[PDB]
């Protein structure tokens, strides 16, 4: 730690000691049903973008690796998460929105985008934490005579707020002359239809879009991943996986006053202090494993190679594993130097009126004194 | 605001004013000497036993050795400050059991063996007025590891690598140094600040002090009872002033509060996101792949390093100010306790 | 109708999330009812149009010692096109619809204990907010004009209705008295005690003293 | 700018530290002027004869 | 027609607070110190002000420096004329040369140039496409403008922290000089000093 081969007399702070974890536990709820992504992904027909569907996926285990066998897309477009880590973490509610758009407008299914689809048809929030899946469909959504079952909205008095629908079909009035049903030169019906034909370019093909919106942990968790659970162990340094929250620490029974709706506890530095087990409803404190600071008291390298080691801030009935003499000091206990009843001037300072030195006894050794 | 009361000296070129009586007065000056010695671990603060953050922090640079060197230099500097101010006598003197120092009491500044810590009554008041926080290793890693229904800031800063080192000299040794200085000053005068201690009766020493300030020594010997009573009443007045008013020690209390709020701000800066998707490394490493979590962890590493460097720079400036005050206190102990000073208002 | 006006002193404080915090002064920015706001007292007696607007939040508070208020029908146009919450105190069901039949097609239907579990005046405070296509109902049953003191409101129930709300109307079924106040986006400073309850709060827009406190 | 202000509140708490440091500096300058000049308890005046 | 630097720094949030004591109050403090010094001597710094003629006070000062007091009373006119000519020479040297106050003028120049470079740091790009936030808002979507705004925020925060650190170091130096000035006022105006070249 000094980047040198010779060490002068003094006390040096080298590193910190840590109690390494021994076991690993995983705690997931008791959920056995399978999520119906299949019912979402192949259907006889989808809906228009102004009347987009929404399916609630809840109380099931979700496998996201069977998505690739249902539709011939290229890759996920995930915001906030990554598609390869979707099996290692658990949500509370997953929604699925299904609609068909043109290939020009797939780029408007991103957060923070404006245009025509993202203004009057389907608007995403800027805090989006989901994945957008879009694939070409020219063999099911197009006809040689023209497929006119898909509609979209051009005219609307205001912009759509995120995650809301407008299935109203009323005649727009952009002019100053009221019509109330007459589609004149100033009143138009704001639902035009795509003229989908198979003999188009690649930018005008229909594209089936499925948008998965994830809801993070603010509740008891319902839509988890396919991972087995482990028996709960307490009073030991382990690794825990409580509902996708990963950390290292010890677990103790708590005497806290958690309300029924609350599930987590947080500290001043916004780290998790207490957690509620998902299988049995009990509260467990999360205390980090035992640590501290290690200081090395040595004389010069030219003098000798004897070393005393000080563990800062602990009473050492708590060291997991230098010399064999143990002396307790207010600055943590000192191992490797015996305590003599004399008193000399301070050679190497330790703290709280205790110093150390390399002196004889009658056979040279490191001694500690006041 | 009012600058002061209006006055006009009745000046004339054949008129003088000469006092006919005096007043012995005891004042009080409070000077900071040292401050809290802190020790900061980088890996527990910035990363907190995450292997990926530790690898990126090793890949980042070598700023943490510089921060550790600066904080170690500050701690050794405060130990040097306390040793410079208090350790000025080579022998621990002792007072005689008879306490008749010419009618002067000296009973509230000399130690008494009733308390386990041999401190005087005014020293007990001065240690009672300052509400000390982070006094050293008082938690000792046993209360933090247990279950407390209301966690304090000390455990939250201990779990993030922010510790407090104890001072080298305990308060018993500081009280012993001040007791030795008081015994040498009472029984010797200024002769123990030059060579060996020379005993002298306290009345004759006080006559030497009056000869020092420019007054003939017959004034003291003909008014010894009045001077002793005035000194006792001044000691009683500063007794009642230290007992009643709690705003006198607002320099030392400000030092303690400054160190506490600096450590509290350093703890509270861990909850900031610094542009990343979350402020915790575990959710970033669990919700993302390697490539994107590298960018988010890099943003958090840069933010926490900037916060730690800001803390270290402010600590360096505060240590320079405290060292200047400690040099002033050492000069005052050398020139006013070990002798008589002719400097005006020093 | 008998429209009246009174003062809501300190009520309307609810838990902003579902995270346990103890001995922590937390600062939150959400849609709260402002301190010392001017709320409306309604002495509606039928022997009277309850078609109130919504405006981003409802404080709804009734000092009824009995259970004579059924529920609240939300929405924009309520002329048997799309209705809303049809809560009944029959202790069997809370039915939510996106359809007709305002009073005598099934959306999310919910079964639990009745809201009015108890029989002093026993003020009932509710919070109805609607942001990001999601709707929350906070409630706290305070046993006893509006009283003095900070009483926190728990998220007793949640509801995924996902519909637009512009108006608000209370359904009775003789003499009734209920308060309606409006929520605004404001910054608060809540005080959690050692048991995790919010016993006091500071509004950061009332007077310069509270702004200094924040 | 609303977006920059939202990102700055999202950033951290550096600015309260900067404001606290500048306020301490200004109070220190006022204390400097007070402890240099205000050393006399009364405002004396010279006689008209000079 | 030509904007000064004060408006350009006031429009960007950099203000200057006034001092607590006005210049009239400092002049009153110095006039009270002068009146006490020339009508009482050093006695107004210990207790009450005790009047004494100025010849007897100067005899006290010569007895302080080690010269017997009969030197002044036999050479009073010569000493008074030498003092008056010295005061006239100080007046002439202050009227001719303006380079004596180059500590106070450097303090003013240092603060002015620090605020001026803090203003001039707002025209830098810091790796972004523009130094104007409004062009970044109007020219880009949300996602890219967030990146450019983050870069500008980091650069401006670094510049402002550098300014604050330099101000703290200058304030420590100024406080040391103020402590020296307070010691000089306490020891040399309120009494006679035995320290060599103080
Ligand atoms: C000088 O001052 C002291 C007090 O500062 C005077 O002592 C007081 O004298 C009165 C009158 O006899 C007593 O009632 C007080 O009890 C005395 N006080 C103390 C503390 O002894 C003293 O008389 C003054 N001397 C002259 C000559 O004026
Ligand atoms: C020195 O001062 C102390 C402190 O006031 C005196 O102790 C007091 O003595 C009186 C009478 O004996 C008691 O009524 C008080 O309770 C004592 N105070 C304390 C704090 O113990 C002491 O008497 C003085 N010395 C002399 C010689 O009189
Ligand atoms: C919930 O999980 C526990 C785990 O031990 C299990 O015993 C219990 O049967 C589960 N409940 C249901 C309804 O499956
Ligand atoms: C969808 O379901 C049908 C019948 O359930 C099945 O034949 C078909 O292969 C599935 N997939 C697609 C892409 O149509
Ligand atoms: C450390 O542990 C021992 C034994 O459990 C205990 O007696 C002691 O008080 C503890 N603390 C210190 C500071 O030694
Ligand atoms: C509320 O407003 C009404 C009129 O808008 C007014 O008469 C009444 O006094 C107000 N109540 C207050 C300020 O408490
Ligand atoms: C059921 O509700 C839908 C709208 O959600 C409406 O179109 C339909 O007409 C309703 N059914 C009947 C029988 O009215
Ligand atoms: C709800 O409907 C109204 C129609 O009065 C409309 O103006 C508004 O945009 C809709 N959406 C809201 C309030 O989110
Ligand atoms: C917390 O709850 C306990 C248990 O009833 C009670 O004794 C204590 O007073 C409560 N604390 C506060 C601050 O109300």
Secondary structure (H, E, C), B273-315: CCCCCCCCHHHHHHHCCHHHHHHHHHHHHHHHHHHHHHHHHHH
Which atom of ligand 7 is least distant from the CA of C99? 2
CB contact under 8 A, A126 and E142: yes
> Which numbered ligand comes closest to the C-alpha of A232?
3
Cβ contacts below 8 Å, chain A against chain C, sum to 46
Integer Cα distance of B9 and B11 in angstroms? 6
**CB C70, CB C87: distance < 8 Å:** yes
Partners of E114 in the β-ladder: none
> Which numbered ligand comes closest to the C-alpha of C181?
6
Integer Cα distance of C62 and C171 in angstroms? 13
Looking at beta carbons, which residues of chain A come within 8 Å of C133? 161-164
CB contact under 8 A, A257 and C154: no
Judged by phi (left if over 0) then psi (alpha if -120 to 50, else beta), residue C2 lies in: left
HSE of A314 in the Cβ direction (CA atoms, 13 Å)?
22
Cβ contacts below 8 Å, chain D against chain E, sum to 93
HSE of B232 in the Cβ direction (CA atoms, 13 Å)?
12
Q: Angle CA(C190)–CA(C196)–CA(C201) in degrees, nearest 5? A: 15
Looking at beta carbons, which residues of chain D come within 8 Å of B273? 10-11
Question: Which residue of B149, B156, B280 is the best one to mutate when testing the C interface, meaning the one whose CB has the most C CBs within 10 A?
Answer: B149
Helix (H) or strand (E) holding A119: helix A117-120
Integer Cα distance of A134 and A129 in angstroms? 17
Partners of A246 in the β-ladder: A241
Partners of C186 in the β-ladder: C30
Q: For chain A, how long is the longest CA-to-CA vector? A: 117
Q: Which of D4, D33, D40 sits opposite E33 (nearest CB)?
A: D40
Which residues, in sequence order, are CB contacts of A308 under 8 Å at separation 6+? Answer: A296, A297, A298, A322, A323, A334, A335, A336, A337, A356, A366, A368
Tell me, in angstroms, the distance from the centre of ligand 6 to residue C146's CA.
Answer: 15
Which residues, in sequence order, are CB contacts of D50 under 8 Å at separation 6+? Answer: none
Q: Give the residue ranges of DSSP H helices in chain B.
A: 42, 51-60, 63-86, 121-129, 153-158, 171-187, 202-213, 218-221, 224-244, 252-268, 281-287, 290-332
Q: Please give the C-alpha separations between residue A322 and each of A15, A296, A347, in angstroms, as whole numbers.
A: 15, 9, 19
Helix, strand or coil, per DSSP, at residue C122: coil
Integer Cα distance of A202 and B191 in angstroms? 104
Tell me, in angstroms, the distance from the centre of ligand 5 to residue A327's CA.
Answer: 12
Integer Cα distance of C76 and A33 in angstroms? 38
Q: Hey, is the C-beta of D39 within 8 angstroms of any chain E C-beta?
A: yes
Integer Cα distance of E79 and E86 in angstroms? 10
Q: Which residues of chain C have a Cβ shorter than 8 Å from any chain B Cβ?
A: 22-23, 194
Which atom of ligand 2 is least distant from the CA of B99? 27
Question: Could you tell me if the CB of C193 is within 6 A of ligand 9?
Answer: yes
Neighbours of A12 (CB within 10 A): 14
* Residue A2 buriedness (CB in 10 A; 0-12 / 13-18 / 19+): exposed
Integer Cα distance of B285 and A1 in angstroms? 29
A354-359 and A334-335: which strand pairing?
unpaired
Question: Could you tell me if the CB of A318 is within 6 A of ligand 5?
Answer: no
* Residue A188 buriedness (CB in 10 A; 0-12 / 13-18 / 19+): middle
CB contact under 8 A, E21 and D34: yes
Q: Hey, is the C-beta of B197 within 8 angstroms of any chain A C-beta?
A: no
At C185, list the tokens.
Answer: 């986006």
Technique that determined the structure: cryo-EM
* Residue A4 buriedness (CB in 10 A; 0-12 / 13-18 / 19+): exposed
Q: Hey, is the C-beta of C195 within 8 angstroms of any chain A C-beta?
A: yes
Q: Please give the C-alpha separations between residue C111 and each of B333, C87, C115, E97, E176, in angstroms, as whole numbers.
A: 81, 10, 11, 94, 75
Q: Hey, is the C-beta of B27 within 8 angstroms of any chain E C-beta?
A: no
Tell me, in angstroms, the distance from the centre of ligand 4 to residue A40's CA.
Answer: 11
Integer Cα distance of A141 and A205 in angstroms? 9
Tell me, in angstroms, the distance from the centre of ligand 9 to residue B152's CA.
Answer: 18
Name the strands in the sheet holding C86-87, side by side, starting at the edge strand that comes first in the sequence: C86-87, C94-95, C109-110
Q: Hey, is the C-beta of E174 within 8 angstroms of any chain D C-beta?
A: yes
Phi, psi of C39 (to 5 degrees): -105, 165
At B74, list the tokens.
Answer: 């500050």
A53-57 and A326-327: which strand pairing?
unpaired
Question: Which residue of B147, B148, B150, B279 is the best one to mutate when testing the C interface, meaning the one whose CB has the most C CBs within 10 A?
Answer: B150
**Closest by Cα among A226, A220, A271 to B282:** A271
Looking at beta carbons, which residues of chain B come within 8 Å of D14? 307, 310
Q: Hey, is the C-beta of B324 within 8 angstroms of any chain E C-beta?
A: yes
**CB A366, CB A341: distance < 8 Å:** no
**CB B11, CB D48: distance < 8 Å:** no
Residues near ligand 3 (Cβ within 6 A): A 30, 279
Question: Which DSSP category does B246 fall into?
Answer: S
Tell me, in angstroms, the distance from the centre of ligand 1 to residue B230's CA.
Answer: 10
> Which numbered ligand comes closest to the C-alpha of B237?
2
Q: Which residues of chain A have a Cβ shorter than 8 Å from any chain E Cβ?
A: 111-113, 126
Q: Do chains D and A touch (3 or more CB pairs under 8 A)?
A: no
- Nearest-CA distance B168 → chain D (Å): 31
Tell me, in angstroms, the distance from the centre of ligand 8 to residue C109's CA.
Answer: 25
Which residues, in sequence order, are CB contacts of C65 under 8 Å at separation 6+? Answer: C119, C120, C121, C122
Integer Cα distance of C25 and C17 in angstroms? 15
Partners of C137 in the β-ladder: C128, C157
Integer Cα distance of B117 and C25 in angstroms? 39
**CB A16, CB B43: distance < 8 Å:** yes
Tell me, in angstroms, the distance from the centre of ligand 2 to residue B239's CA.
Answer: 12
Neighbours of chain E (3+ CB pairs under 8 A): A, B, D
Which residues, in sequence order, are CB contacts of E167 under 8 Å at separation 6+? Answer: D21, D22, D25, E114
Integer Cα distance of A329 and C180 in angstroms? 66
- How many helices and strands, by DSSP H and E, does chain A display? 2, 24
A151-152 and A93-102: which strand pairing?
unpaired
Q: Hey, is the C-beta of E169 within 8 angstroms of any chain B C-beta?
A: yes
At A59, list the tokens.
Answer: 């109380």
Question: Could you tell me if the CB of B21 is within 6 A of ligand 1?
Answer: yes
Taking CA atoms only, the protein residue closest to ligand 8 atom 7 is A158
Cα C51–chain centre separation: 17
Helix, strand or coil, per DSSP, at residue C190: strand
**Closest by Cα among B234, B204, B209 to B221:** B204
The alpha-carbon radius of gyration of chain B (Å, integer) is 28
A365-369 and A338-339: which strand pairing?
parallel
Tell me, in angstroms, the distance from the centre of ligand 2 to residue B108's CA.
Answer: 9
At E145, list the tokens.
Answer: 């403008």
Looking at beta carbons, which residues of chain E come within 8 Å of A126? 142
* Residue C186 buriedness (CB in 10 A; 0-12 / 13-18 / 19+): middle
Integer Cα distance of B299 and B53 in angstroms? 11
**Closest by Cα among B31, B41, B20 to B325:** B31
- Nearest-CA distance E157 → chain B (Å): 11
Question: Which DSSP category does E13 fall into?
Answer: T
**Closest by Cα among A20, A246, A19, A283 to B147:** A283
Tell me, in angstroms, the distance from the centre of ligand 9 to residue C13's CA.
Answer: 20
Integer Cα distance of B114 and B119 in angstroms? 9
Looking at beta carbons, which residues of chain B come within 8 Å of E63? none
Integer Cα distance of B296 and B289 in angstroms? 11
**CB B70, CB B311: distance < 8 Å:** no
Which residue shows structure tokens 């579990």?
A: C117
**CB B43, CB B161: distance < 8 Å:** yes
**CB B27, CB B146: distance < 8 Å:** no
Looking at beta carbons, which residues of chain D come within 8 Å of B300? none
CB contact under 8 A, B275 and D7: yes
Integer Cα distance of C124 and C67 in angstroms? 11
Looking at beta carbons, which residues of chain A come within 8 Å of C24? 268
How many residues in total does chain E contain?
Answer: 198
Distance between first and last Cα of chain D: 65
Question: Could you tell me if the CB of B105 is within 6 A of ligand 2?
Answer: yes
Helix-, strand-, coil-residue percentages of chain D, each rounded to 5:
70, 5, 30
- Nearest-CA distance C207 → chain A (Å): 28
């Amino acid at each position: 730690t000094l980047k040198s081969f010779t060490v002068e007399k003094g006390i040096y702070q080298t590193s910190n000691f840590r109690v390494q974890p021994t076991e690993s536990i995983v705690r997931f709820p008791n959920i056995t049903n399978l999520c119906p992504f299949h019912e979402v992904f192949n259907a006889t027909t989808f809906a228009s973008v102004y009347a987009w569907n929404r399916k609630r996926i809840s109380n099931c285990v979700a496998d996201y690796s069977v998505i690739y066998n249902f539709a011939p897309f290229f890759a996920f477009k995930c915001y906030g998460v990554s598609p390869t880590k979707l099996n290692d973490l658990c949500f509370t509610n997953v929604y699925a929105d299904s609609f068909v758009i043109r290939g020009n407008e797939v780029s408007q299914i991103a957060p923070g985008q404006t245009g025509n689809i993202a203004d009057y048809n389907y608007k995403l929030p800027d805090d989006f934490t989901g994945c957008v899946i879009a694939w070409n469909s020219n063999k099911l959504d197009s006809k040689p005579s023209g497929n006119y079952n898909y509609l979209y909205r051009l005219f609307r008095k205001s912009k759509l707020k995120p995650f809301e629908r407008d299935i109203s079909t009323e005649i727009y009035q952009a002019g100053n002359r009221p019509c109330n049903g007459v589609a004149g030169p100033n009143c138009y019906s704001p639902l035009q239809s795509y003229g989908f034909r198979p003999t188009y370019g690649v930018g005008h093909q229909p594209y089936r879009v499925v948008v998965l919106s994830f809801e993070l942990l603010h509740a008891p968790a319902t839509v988890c991943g396919p991972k087995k659970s482990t028996n709960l162990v307490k009073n030991k340094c382990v690794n825990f996986n409580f509902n996708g929250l990963t950390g290292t620490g010890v677990l103790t029974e708590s005497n806290k006053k958690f309300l029924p709706f609350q599930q987590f506890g947080r500290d001043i530095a916004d780290t998790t202090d207490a957690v509620r087990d998902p299988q049995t409803l009990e509260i467990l404190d999360i205390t980090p494993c035992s640590f501290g600071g290690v200081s090395v008291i040595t004389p010069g390298t030219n003098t000798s190679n004897q070393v005393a080691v000080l563990y800062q801030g602990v009473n050492c009935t708590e060291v997991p594993v230098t010399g064999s003499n143990v002396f307790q000091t207010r600055a943590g206990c000192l191992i490797g130097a015996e305590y003599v009843n004399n008193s000399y001037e301070c050679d190497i300072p330790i703290g709280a009126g205790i110093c150390a030195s390399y002196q004889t006894q009658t056979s040279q050794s490191i001694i500690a004194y006041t | 605001m009012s600058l002061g009361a209006e006055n006009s000296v009745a000046y004339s070129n054949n008129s003088i004013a000469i006092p006919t009586n005096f007043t012995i007065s005891v004042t009080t000056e409070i000077l900071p000497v040292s401050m809290t010695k802190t020790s900061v671990d980088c890996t527990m603060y910035i990363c907190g036993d995450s292997t990926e953050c530790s690898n990126l922090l090793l890949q980042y640079g070598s700023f943490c050795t510089q921060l550790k060197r600066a904080l170690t230099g500050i701690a050794v500097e405060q130990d040097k400050n306390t040793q410079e101010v208090f350790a000025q006598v080579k022998q621990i003197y002792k007072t005689p059991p008879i306490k008749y120092f010419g009618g002067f009491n000296f009973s509230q500044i000399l130690p008494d063996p009733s308390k386990p810590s041999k401190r005087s009554f005014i020293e007990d008041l001065l240690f009672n007025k300052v509400t000390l926080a982070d006094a050293g290793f008082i938690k000792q890693y046993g209360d933090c590891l247990g279950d407390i229904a209301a966690r304090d800031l000390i455990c939250a800063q201990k779990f993030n690598g922010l510790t407090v080192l104890p001072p080298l000299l305990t308060d018993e040794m500081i009280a012993q140094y001040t007791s030795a200085l008081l015994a040498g000053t009472i029984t010797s005068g200024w002769t123990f600040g030059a060579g060996a201690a020379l005993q002298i009766p306290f009345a004759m020493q006080m006559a030497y002090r009056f000869n020092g300030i420019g007054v003939t020594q017959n004034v003291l010997y003909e008014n010894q009872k009045l001077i002793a009573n005035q000194f006792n009443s001044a000691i009683g007045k500063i007794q009642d002033s230290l007992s009643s008013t709690a705003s006198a020690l607002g320099k030392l209390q400000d030092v303690v509060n400054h160190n506490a709020q600096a450590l509290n701000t350093l703890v509270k800066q861990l909850s900031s996101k610094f542009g990343a998707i979350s402020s915790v490394l575990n959710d970033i490493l669990s919700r993302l792949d390697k490539v994107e979590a590298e960018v988010q962890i890099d943003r958090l590493i840069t933010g926490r390093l900037q916060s730690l460097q800001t803390y270290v720079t402010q600590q360096l400036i505060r240590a320079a100010e405290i060292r200047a005050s400690a040099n002033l206190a050492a000069t005052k102990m050398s020139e006013c306790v070990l002798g008589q000073s002719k400097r005006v208002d020093f | 109708r008998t429209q009246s006006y009174t003062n809501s002193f300190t009520r309307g404080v609810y838990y902003p999330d579902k995270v346990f915090r103890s001995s922590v002064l937390h600062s939150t920015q959400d849609l709260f009812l402002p301190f010392f706001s001017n709320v409306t007292w309604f002495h509606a007696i039928h022997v009277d149009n309850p078609a109130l607007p919504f405006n981003d939040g409802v404080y709804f508070a009734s000092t009824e010692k009995s259970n004579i208020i059924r529920g609240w029908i939300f929405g924009t146009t309520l002329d048997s096109k799309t209705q809303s919450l049809l809560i009944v105190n029959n202790a069997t069901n809370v039915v939510i619809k996106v359809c007709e039949f305002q009073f005598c097609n099934c959306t999310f239907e919910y079964v639990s204990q009745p809201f009015l579990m108890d029989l002093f005046k026993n003020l009932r405070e509710f919070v109805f907010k609607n942001i990001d296509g999601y709707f929350k109902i906070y409630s706290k049953h305070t046993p006893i004009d509006l009283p003095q003191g900070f009483s926190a409101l728990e998220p007793l129930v949640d509801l995924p209705i996902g519909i637009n709300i512009t108006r608000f109307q209370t359904l009775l079924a003789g003499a009734a008295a209920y308060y309606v106040g409006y929520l605004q986006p404001r910054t608060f400073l809540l005080k959690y005690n050692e048991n995790g309850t919010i016993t006091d709060a500071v509004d950061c827009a009332l007077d310069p003293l509270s702004e200094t406190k924040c």
